């Protein structure tokens, strides 16, 4: 009436919960790159010679 060893298991199942990968879009930056410093339009000379 006691507990005895039974037949060895024939296989093992290991369960884990996993989600999946999306598409590669690689959206690097809101406003991207190093935007260049640049000329103010027209500007004009702010200096003249004497005479």
């Amino acid at each position: 009436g006691g507990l005895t060893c039974a037949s060895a298991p024939q296989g093992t199942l290991r369960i884990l919960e996993g989600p999946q990968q999306s598409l590669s879009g690689s959206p690097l930056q809101p406003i991207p790159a190093s935007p260049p410093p640049q000329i103010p339009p027209g500007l004009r000379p702010r200096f003249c010679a004497f005479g």
Binding site: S24, S26, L28, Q29, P32, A33, S34
Partner: protein, 63 residues
């Protein structure tokens, strides 16, 4: 994301865009001058001076 000193050795981090690739370049840096300190970011055009001179500027801006 936020990465650490040991987690940064196993990942590619572009600096400028157009340096980002498809398989390579897992991450990307926020600004190109992220590498420099707060004081080293106050030196103008540090890119065109030799380096031992940016080390003296950092020590001279504090005197």
């Amino acid at each position: 994301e936020l990465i650490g000193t040991m987690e940064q050795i196993f990942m590619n981090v572009a600096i400028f865009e157009d340096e980002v690739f498809a398989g390579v370049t897992t991450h990307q840096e926020l600004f190109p001058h992220s590498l420099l300190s707060v004081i080293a970011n106050f030196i103008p055009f540090s890119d065109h001076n030799q380096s031992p001179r940016n080390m003296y500027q950092c020590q001279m801006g504090k005197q």
